[PDB]
Symmetry: D2
Subunit: 284 residues, 4 copies
Amino acid sequence: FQQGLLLTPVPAHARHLFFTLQFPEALPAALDALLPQVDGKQLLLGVGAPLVKALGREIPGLRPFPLLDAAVENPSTQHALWLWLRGDDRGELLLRTRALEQALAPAFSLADSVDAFRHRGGRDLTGYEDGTENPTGEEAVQAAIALDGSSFVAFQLWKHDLQYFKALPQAEQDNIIGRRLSDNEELDDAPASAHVKRTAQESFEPEAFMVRRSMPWADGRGAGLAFVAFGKSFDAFEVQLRRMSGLEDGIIDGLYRFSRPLTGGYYWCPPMSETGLDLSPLLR
Amino acid sequence: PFQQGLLLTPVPAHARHLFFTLQFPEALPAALDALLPQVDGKQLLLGVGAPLVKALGREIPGLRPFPLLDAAVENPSTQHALWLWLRGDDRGELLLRTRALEQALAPAFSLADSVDAFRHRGGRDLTGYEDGTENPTGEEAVQAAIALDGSSFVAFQLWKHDLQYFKALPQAEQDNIIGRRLSDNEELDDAPASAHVKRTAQESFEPEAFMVRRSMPWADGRGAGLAFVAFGKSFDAFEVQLRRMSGLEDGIIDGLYRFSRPLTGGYYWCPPMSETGLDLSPLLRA
Amino acid sequence: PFQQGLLLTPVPAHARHLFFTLQFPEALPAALDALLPQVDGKQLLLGVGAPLVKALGREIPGLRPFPLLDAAVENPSTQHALWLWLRGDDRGELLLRTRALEQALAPAFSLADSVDAFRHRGGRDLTGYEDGTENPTGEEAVQAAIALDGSSFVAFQLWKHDLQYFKALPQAEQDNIIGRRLSDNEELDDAPASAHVKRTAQESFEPEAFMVRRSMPWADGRGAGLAFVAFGKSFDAFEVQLRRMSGLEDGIIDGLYRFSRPLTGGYYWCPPMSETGLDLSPLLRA
Amino acid sequence: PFQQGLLLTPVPAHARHLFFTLQFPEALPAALDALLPQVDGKQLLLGVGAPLVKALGREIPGLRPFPLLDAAVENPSTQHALWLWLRGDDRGELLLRTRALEQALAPAFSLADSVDAFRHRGGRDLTGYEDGTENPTGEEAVQAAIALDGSSFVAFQLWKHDLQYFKALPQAEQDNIIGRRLSDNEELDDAPASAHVKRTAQESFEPEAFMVRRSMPWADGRGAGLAFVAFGKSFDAFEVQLRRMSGLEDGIIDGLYRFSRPLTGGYYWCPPMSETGLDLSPLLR
Ligand code: HEM
Ligand code: HEM
Ligand code: HEM
Ligand code: HEM
Ligand SMILES: [Cl-]
Ligand SMILES: [Cl-]
Ligand SMILES: [Cl-]
Ligand SMILES: [Cl-]
């Protein structure tokens, strides 16, 4: 009843599209072209707070990406629509992008774009395995899917300073992540600022589990990780980010030593029906 | 006791805005020792962002990050730690001063964003419209922009224009978006409420929302538009204006959003000037 | 005794082309010490450009810079000193290898150009047409691409496609530009003389102009198109083909120039392989 | 009867170079109808490249594509069909004029390259050295730049500087690369033969290689450097200079290549002016 956000491993190639609603009067023609194409597998769709506000509607649990008043930067760059394309090669995704652009215009204007790819079967560009402690199976459904079959996804485009980080001694890299790069073993003696120490899913009250589908990226803006986290609500992601940002106990996550998010967005993933994507709470 | 430059009558012919992230806080003293003697408030202005204050465990009354507006239009919040405003003679001089500031601020600060700005004609937006007609001048500008202690609070947005769409509209449709006539800059009393000058009428707020604007056009690989800059004695004037423009006051959205949208957003505290340079004392005391 | 990976069909799913300028030739020995142990001719291929040979005061028979064609279409000559062809499993591996090669090759070499390439739909151009159908295979490929001493001479062009224009044409007009039918790749004998496969028919030259092509699609901020690569036992095959495509043989210009244009052009000598690595002796002897 | 603006010294504070590819030559008439009335030779100069002439099956004496130098340094040849030189008061005016020229010139022409250029400190390179000290002036400039029929032949290269490397050199080493003293622009008679002014000494050639340079610094995403422009009554002066700079005359390479390298290269024919606009008659019967 949900989309294909739980399919593991992440595809070898993906592309993230973010649109601004520039001409709301042309919205019906855009939806008529877009909605029949959203199968939740090769094409996923997320709805942003501006689109809901433009329709004068309300989605329980939906809100723009938050504003954290911290010593580290987490920008809020909320858009109206997020499209997640998954495919076989980057050329297919490029041609599919052009078709979606022309089909969504003039109602929607493309505001941002990111090509993403799987690295070495699921590693960050720093080399560390990504997704080790993700919930799987039925635990993944309970962490990511709400009762009505919808999901709430958070997105950040993290930009890595690879030259600084990879020039550190391997023990210093391991103390930033909280795991050993050589064999992915957890470092129990890592400082409290270590990433996996900051984001330990069982260390929150209530527990802050989420389903992450992050993928590395690289273009003219640099290189890093396209962070994606699916949850039954934004509660899990938001308390994690606030602890990572030092807003819980004053200790800042080690990731901010070498990486920084360039964007931030919240999106509501609608459920699927027997006849396509179920946007009924928005179109009545 | 302010920094001046921000009140200097016309905008300089060329300027450059630099935005830095506080990447290594342990190296901050050396960066400040190199930077502060160069801040004269005329050729080089400085603004302090909320992350820098938070990293020092201090607090500046009136300072906060760029707000989050839950509206039908997009106003992103992209707050950085430090804002440097270079004003100069040519773009090459500003480029060379930029490189020198980068080496002096490193490794404590990492350059996060940059925009070259230039004066167009006598002070016009790239659409052709005059910019600054109803700005406060003289003592009214000081009262609107400068707080009692001599500091100022500046808001910044990098607006990106869709010039092809806007300039292809009939001139009457362009005029109804701005609220003034491009042919002679006359105000249109019969413009719809969504017109920009109707949305931002400084006397139509309670209390009055006057501010001192120093916007300048820009153009690079990201496109072209207006680098919007608004100085105030507090952020109240700018923020109540932006919320009305975004339709959060009465449901009417400003006409600017038909062809333009901001890519960035930042709040910065402009410290006052003392007899011996920039006064950063509320951040460097005990 | 050649660089085996130039005959590998199909091309790997991901590759990256690097082009370096010899910026400080006095620092060449340290760069070669780091580079040569990595050149296996499979995951990393190497080509030597005429500027590098001239900087050493030597000569390579068959090597010369990319030619200058005085035609009505543009084939720019952007010859560099070194060409590296990286092939790998995913784009991230090639990115990390690029950074390592950049730091190891410095300061002697400066990276002048870079292109990420990928296989599309099993070996198709971004326009949809199959690429490589009439490539020589087996022993014929060796005879067309490999010189007697085991070296090869490779020509490179970065072609930029106007996909919106081309794909908006009626399918019959697209087919007459390529010379083959998109529906089933069958050759059109009744295509106009300007059709690509009519221009480049390898048996229609005297002597025959066979070559081994390893082109791969590309896409970045500059646009999208085909990273054209042609291996030959000499540059004779490629050059007579390009001159006919450019209308310098019979006044008829190839149809590809209706929607695509090369942004770069380079000639590079691929040295032979020995039992213990790349054989650069004709360049570092005596 | 030339395009006045090419002798205007100093160059205006802001300019923009546009280079177009002839993508659809059948659509050329509508493009020329829109373009030619705008070419005054002052705010808008025009140069014709060899591909445009070849596409019309014509020939211009003295015109040819940018040469191919087989040297140890890189001078790329990136010849285009059309060169437009916009000059104005601010970068925004040039930006709006560029968009208008793009829409008017399409679909025949496609914009292939663009460079914003600006005057630095009254006429200095970004390295600080004065640029234009030994340019011909007055009637000597006319004799060096203008052919008999009033046309000119202009060479263009987009030079990219490595300012970090160059400005980190000792001041004596910087001076030996240029051949002049940065403090007061005095000529260094004891500078090495590789020094720029020693390589390019206009009187040290037979015949003499004088030309009128109108170079201006530039800066965008590709870096920063000098947009080199040289006007001559023919291409002989520029080409014999460049071959010496590249070490093809005596094996000595110009010191500029230690910190700078050209990214583009083009030759263009600047048609003469008549009393009623640009004279393209040798190209349109
Ligand atoms: C540059 C950005 C990031 C990088 C490179 C990164 C990388 C990693 C790595 C290598 C692990 C350990 C392997 C694993 O369990 O998957 C991990 C764990 C985790 N990360 Fe991140 N991550 C990033 C951002 C984030 C953010 C922003 C959040 C939440 C707001 C987050 C939440 C988590 C969680 C929940 C875990 C699992 C913790 C556990 O072991 O229970 N990650 N991350
Ligand atoms: C693309 C962005 C913008 C453009 C092109 C633009 C342009 C203009 C123009 C042409 C005028 C009329 C001439 C003048 O009074 O100076 C004006 C007035 C004004 N604008 Fe904007 N502006 C932009 C953004 C903003 C924003 C974001 C704000 C506030 C949050 C703002 C506040 C004002 C105010 C206060 C006035 C004077 C209104 C009055 O007459 O009292 N502007 N603007
Ligand atoms: C935008 C640039 C180009 C594209 C999209 C392209 C595409 C194609 C396609 C679709 C074919 C037919 C299938 C095949 O046999 O491979 C082909 C054939 C061929 N191409 Fe190209 N090509 C390009 C540039 C070039 C250039 C510059 C040359 C030579 C200088 C060249 C040489 C050949 C040859 C020799 C053949 C085989 C001809 C034969 O049937 O005997 N190609 N190309
Ligand atoms: C990065 C590229 C270049 C830079 C920064 C540069 C800069 C300079 C400077 C500082 C001078 C001395 C002051 C003056 O008399 O103008 C000069 C002189 C000169 N340059 Fe260049 N130049 C460049 C490229 C070229 C090229 C490519 C040519 C010719 C092909 C050239 C030809 C000349 C000539 C003829 C002179 C005058 C020599 C004399 O007779 O004294 N320049 N240039
Ligand atoms: Cl989704
Ligand atoms: Cl940056
Ligand atoms: Cl400028
Ligand atoms: Cl000086």
